[PDB]
Amino acid sequence: GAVALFSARAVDIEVFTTRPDTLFGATYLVLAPEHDLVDELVAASWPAGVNPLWTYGGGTPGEAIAAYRRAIAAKSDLERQEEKTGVFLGSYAINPANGEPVPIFIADYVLAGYGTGAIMAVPGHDQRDWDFARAFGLPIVEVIAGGNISESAYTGDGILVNSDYLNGMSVPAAKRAIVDRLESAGRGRARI
Ligand SMILES: CCOc1ccc(Br)c([C@@H](CN)OB2O[C@@H]3[C@H](O2)[C@@H](COP(=O)(O)O)O[C@H]3n2cnc3c(N)ncnc32)c1
Protein backbone atom coordinates (compact mmCIF):
# COMPACT_ATOMS: atom_id res chain seq x y z
CA GLY A 1 0.00 0.00 0.00
CA ALA A 2 0.81 3.67 0.46
CA VAL A 3 0.44 6.53 2.87
CA ALA A 4 -0.54 9.88 1.34
CA LEU A 5 -1.20 13.41 2.59
CA PHE A 6 -4.27 15.48 1.86
CA SER A 7 -3.88 19.19 2.71
CA ALA A 8 -6.60 21.06 4.58
CA ARG A 9 -8.22 23.59 2.16
CA ALA A 10 -8.42 26.12 5.01
CA VAL A 11 -2.87 20.80 8.56
CA ASP A 12 -2.27 17.51 6.68
CA ILE A 13 -4.44 14.42 6.92
CA GLU A 14 -2.47 11.24 6.40
CA VAL A 15 -4.37 8.31 4.92
CA PHE A 16 -3.36 4.69 4.45
CA THR A 17 -4.52 3.02 1.23
CA THR A 18 -4.04 -0.37 -0.44
CA ARG A 19 -5.25 1.21 -3.73
CA PRO A 20 -3.17 4.36 -4.33
CA ASP A 21 -3.86 3.81 -8.06
CA THR A 22 -7.44 5.03 -7.44
CA LEU A 23 -6.42 8.48 -6.13
CA PHE A 24 -8.28 10.38 -8.89
CA GLY A 25 -11.47 8.66 -7.67
CA ALA A 26 -11.15 9.76 -4.02
CA THR A 27 -14.22 11.94 -3.58
CA TYR A 28 -14.23 12.43 0.23
CA LEU A 29 -12.12 11.66 3.33
CA VAL A 30 -13.20 9.74 6.42
CA LEU A 31 -11.54 10.03 9.84
CA ALA A 32 -12.23 7.78 12.82
CA PRO A 33 -14.56 9.63 15.21
CA GLU A 34 -11.73 9.73 17.80
CA HIS A 35 -9.05 10.99 15.35
CA ASP A 36 -6.90 13.76 16.96
CA LEU A 37 -7.43 16.13 14.01
CA VAL A 38 -11.24 16.14 14.12
CA ASP A 39 -11.66 18.94 16.68
CA GLU A 40 -9.13 21.05 14.71
CA LEU A 41 -10.92 20.53 11.39
CA VAL A 42 -14.49 21.16 12.60
CA ALA A 43 -15.95 24.30 10.97
CA ALA A 44 -17.83 26.94 13.00
CA SER A 45 -20.89 26.72 10.72
CA TRP A 46 -22.44 24.58 7.98
CA PRO A 47 -21.97 25.70 4.39
CA ALA A 48 -25.06 27.24 2.82
CA GLY A 49 -27.15 24.54 1.11
CA VAL A 50 -25.56 21.62 2.98
CA ASN A 51 -27.29 18.24 2.49
CA PRO A 52 -29.28 17.66 5.72
CA LEU A 53 -28.18 14.00 5.60
CA TRP A 54 -24.64 15.17 6.35
CA THR A 55 -25.38 17.18 9.52
CA TYR A 56 -26.71 14.55 11.98
CA GLY A 57 -29.50 17.08 12.69
CA GLY A 58 -26.99 19.30 14.54
CA GLY A 59 -27.21 23.10 14.33
CA THR A 60 -23.42 23.43 13.98
CA PRO A 61 -20.67 20.97 13.02
CA GLY A 62 -19.28 20.95 16.58
CA GLU A 63 -22.69 20.11 18.05
CA ALA A 64 -23.22 17.36 15.43
CA ILE A 65 -19.80 15.81 16.11
CA ALA A 66 -20.40 15.76 19.90
CA ALA A 67 -23.81 14.18 19.26
CA TYR A 68 -22.38 11.52 16.95
CA ARG A 69 -19.64 10.64 19.47
CA ARG A 70 -22.24 10.36 22.24
CA ALA A 71 -24.71 8.36 20.10
CA ILE A 72 -22.26 5.73 18.89
CA ALA A 73 -21.26 5.10 22.54
CA ALA A 74 -24.80 3.65 22.89
CA LYS A 75 -23.92 1.02 20.28
CA SER A 76 -23.09 -2.48 21.52
CA ASP A 77 -20.95 -5.26 20.04
CA LEU A 78 -24.07 -6.26 18.11
CA GLU A 79 -24.24 -3.02 16.11
CA ARG A 80 -20.46 -2.86 15.57
CA GLN A 81 -20.64 -6.43 14.18
CA GLU A 82 -23.58 -5.87 11.80
CA GLU A 83 -25.63 0.60 7.72
CA LYS A 84 -23.27 3.56 7.17
CA THR A 85 -23.57 6.57 9.48
CA GLY A 86 -21.42 9.64 9.98
CA VAL A 87 -21.08 13.43 9.99
CA PHE A 88 -19.57 16.11 7.76
CA LEU A 89 -16.99 18.28 9.56
CA GLY A 90 -18.01 21.35 7.52
CA SER A 91 -14.51 21.50 6.03
CA TYR A 92 -12.57 20.28 2.99
CA ALA A 93 -9.25 18.73 2.11
CA ILE A 94 -7.40 18.91 -1.21
CA ASN A 95 -7.02 15.75 -3.29
CA PRO A 96 -3.30 15.83 -4.19
CA ALA A 97 -3.83 14.15 -7.60
CA ASN A 98 -6.51 16.42 -9.10
CA GLY A 99 -6.29 19.47 -6.79
CA GLU A 100 -10.04 19.18 -6.12
CA PRO A 101 -11.60 19.94 -2.74
CA VAL A 102 -13.16 16.90 -1.05
CA PRO A 103 -15.41 17.02 2.04
CA ILE A 104 -14.12 15.58 5.34
CA PHE A 105 -16.34 13.27 7.45
CA ILE A 106 -16.12 11.23 10.56
CA ALA A 107 -17.77 7.82 10.47
CA ASP A 108 -17.55 4.81 12.76
CA TYR A 109 -16.71 2.47 9.87
CA VAL A 110 -13.21 3.90 10.15
CA LEU A 111 -11.30 2.55 13.16
CA ALA A 112 -9.06 4.89 15.21
CA GLY A 113 -6.34 2.38 16.13
CA TYR A 114 -5.69 1.05 12.65
CA GLY A 115 -3.47 2.40 9.87
CA THR A 116 -3.42 6.16 10.33
CA GLY A 117 -7.04 6.28 11.56
CA ALA A 118 -8.09 7.95 8.31
CA ILE A 119 -8.97 6.83 4.81
CA MET A 120 -9.45 8.25 1.37
CA ALA A 121 -12.89 7.18 0.19
CA VAL A 122 -13.19 5.81 -3.34
CA PRO A 123 -16.83 4.77 -3.82
CA GLY A 124 -16.16 3.57 -7.36
CA HIS A 125 -13.87 0.79 -6.14
CA ASP A 126 -14.41 0.07 -2.45
CA GLN A 127 -17.86 -1.31 -1.55
CA ARG A 128 -17.69 0.20 1.95
CA ASP A 129 -17.22 3.66 0.43
CA TRP A 130 -19.85 2.93 -2.25
CA ASP A 131 -22.42 2.13 0.46
CA PHE A 132 -21.55 5.30 2.41
CA ALA A 133 -21.62 7.48 -0.71
CA ARG A 134 -25.00 6.10 -1.75
CA ALA A 135 -26.46 6.76 1.72
CA PHE A 136 -25.06 10.31 1.89
CA GLY A 137 -25.29 11.40 -1.74
CA LEU A 138 -21.55 11.74 -2.35
CA PRO A 139 -19.92 11.54 -5.82
CA ILE A 140 -19.10 8.11 -7.19
CA VAL A 141 -16.39 8.25 -9.86
CA GLU A 142 -15.02 5.44 -12.02
CA VAL A 143 -11.23 5.36 -12.33
CA ILE A 144 -10.74 1.63 -13.04
CA ALA A 145 -12.60 0.39 -16.13
CA GLY A 146 -13.78 -3.20 -15.90
CA GLY A 147 -17.03 -3.17 -13.92
CA ASN A 148 -20.28 -1.23 -13.58
CA ILE A 149 -20.21 1.38 -10.83
CA SER A 150 -23.96 2.00 -11.13
CA GLU A 151 -24.41 -1.58 -9.80
CA SER A 152 -21.63 -1.96 -7.19
CA ALA A 153 -18.02 -1.00 -6.50
CA TYR A 154 -15.62 -2.53 -9.00
CA THR A 155 -12.80 -4.07 -6.97
CA GLY A 156 -10.82 -5.98 -9.62
CA ASP A 157 -7.98 -5.24 -12.02
CA GLY A 158 -8.58 -3.10 -15.08
CA ILE A 159 -7.49 -0.05 -16.99
CA LEU A 160 -7.18 3.49 -15.63
CA VAL A 161 -9.73 6.08 -16.80
CA ASN A 162 -10.47 9.67 -15.68
CA SER A 163 -6.99 9.75 -14.13
CA ASP A 164 -4.88 12.08 -16.32
CA TYR A 165 -1.27 10.73 -16.49
CA LEU A 166 -2.38 7.29 -15.30
CA ASN A 167 -4.89 6.77 -18.16
CA GLY A 168 -4.53 3.47 -19.98
CA MET A 169 -2.34 1.85 -17.32
CA SER A 170 -3.10 -1.43 -15.55
CA VAL A 171 -3.71 -1.34 -11.80
CA PRO A 172 -0.18 -2.61 -10.98
CA ALA A 173 1.40 -0.04 -13.34
CA ALA A 174 -0.79 2.77 -11.96
CA LYS A 175 0.12 1.92 -8.34
CA ARG A 176 3.83 2.31 -9.21
CA ALA A 177 3.29 5.53 -11.17
CA ILE A 178 1.21 7.26 -8.49
CA VAL A 179 3.60 6.30 -5.66
CA ASP A 180 6.44 7.69 -7.82
CA ARG A 181 4.45 10.92 -8.20
CA LEU A 182 3.66 11.13 -4.47
CA GLU A 183 7.33 10.68 -3.63
CA SER A 184 8.46 13.25 -6.17
CA ALA A 185 6.05 15.75 -4.54
CA GLY A 186 7.04 14.75 -1.00
CA ARG A 187 3.42 13.83 -0.21
CA GLY A 188 3.45 10.03 0.15
CA ARG A 189 5.36 6.77 0.54
CA ALA A 190 4.95 3.10 -0.29
CA ARG A 191 4.29 1.15 2.93
CA ILE A 192 3.93 -2.59 3.72
C1 LIG B 1 -8.77 -3.85 2.13
C2 LIG B 1 -9.33 -3.27 0.86
O1 LIG B 1 -9.12 -1.84 0.96
C3 LIG B 1 -9.41 -1.06 -0.11
C4 LIG B 1 -10.04 -1.54 -1.27
C5 LIG B 1 -10.34 -0.73 -2.38
C6 LIG B 1 -10.04 0.63 -2.36
BR1 LIG B 1 -10.35 1.75 -3.82
C7 LIG B 1 -9.36 1.20 -1.18
C8 LIG B 1 -8.97 2.60 -0.94
C9 LIG B 1 -10.22 3.47 -0.71
N1 LIG B 1 -11.02 3.03 0.45
O2 LIG B 1 -8.25 2.51 0.30
B1 LIG B 1 -8.38 1.25 0.98
O3 LIG B 1 -9.20 1.46 2.18
C10 LIG B 1 -8.44 1.57 3.36
C11 LIG B 1 -7.22 0.75 3.02
O4 LIG B 1 -7.17 0.80 1.60
C12 LIG B 1 -7.56 -0.65 3.53
C13 LIG B 1 -6.49 -1.21 4.45
O5 LIG B 1 -6.94 -2.50 4.90
P1 LIG B 1 -5.85 -3.63 5.32
O6 LIG B 1 -4.94 -2.93 6.27
O7 LIG B 1 -6.68 -4.74 5.91
O8 LIG B 1 -5.19 -4.01 4.01
O9 LIG B 1 -8.77 -0.55 4.31
C14 LIG B 1 -9.09 0.83 4.53
N2 LIG B 1 -8.61 1.35 5.84
C15 LIG B 1 -7.41 1.86 6.16
N3 LIG B 1 -7.38 2.28 7.44
C16 LIG B 1 -8.61 2.00 7.95
C17 LIG B 1 -9.18 2.21 9.20
N4 LIG B 1 -8.48 2.76 10.23
N5 LIG B 1 -10.47 1.82 9.35
C18 LIG B 1 -11.20 1.26 8.37
N6 LIG B 1 -10.67 1.07 7.15
C19 LIG B 1 -9.38 1.44 6.94
C20 LIG B 1 -9.07 0.39 -0.03
Numbering used by the authors: 313 to 322, 330 to 401, 404 to 513
The study reports:
Leucyl-tRNA synthetase (LeuRS) is a class I AARS that has two active sites separated by a distance of 30 Å, a synthetic site that aminoacylates tRNALeu, and an editing site that ensures the fidelity of translation by a proofreading mechanism. Recently, boron-containing compounds known as oxaboroles have been shown to inhibit LeuRS by the oxaborole tRNA-trapping (OBORT) mechanism, which exploits the ability of the boron atom to bond to the cis-diols of the 3′-terminal adenosine nucleotide Ade76 of tRNALeu. The resulting covalent adduct traps the 3′ end of tRNALeu in the editing site in a nonproductive complex, inhibiting leucylation and thereby protein synthesis. Here, we report the discovery of novel 3-aminomethyl derivatives that have potent antitubercular activity.
The most potent analogs were compounds with halogen substitutions at position 4, bromo (compound 11), chloro (compound 4), and fluoro (compound 6) substitutions, which improved MIC values more than 5-fold over those compound 1. We therefore decided to measure the direct binding of the compounds to the editing domain using isothermal titration calorimetry (ITC) and found that the 4-Cl and 4-Br substitutions significantly enhanced the affinity of the compounds for the M. tuberculosis LeuRS editing domain. This increased affinity is due to a significant gain in the enthalpic contribution (3.1 to 4.4 kcal mol−1), which is consistent with additional favorable interactions being established by the halogen atoms in the editing site. To further explore interactions at the 4-position, we cocrystallized compounds with 4-Cl and 4-Br substitutions in the presence of AMP and solved the structures of the ternary complexes at 1.45- and 1.47-Å resolutions, respectively. The structures showed that the halogenated compounds bind to the editing site without major structural changes, and as predicted, the 4-Cl/Br atoms now occupied the position of the sulfur in bound methionine, allowing van der Waals interactions with the neighboring protein atoms. These results confirmed the importance of the size and nature of the substitution at position 4 and agreed well with the in vitro activities and thermodynamic analyses. Therefore, we tested them in a GKO mouse model of acute TB, which showed that all three compounds were very efficacious, with racemate compound 11 having efficacy similar to that of isoniazid.
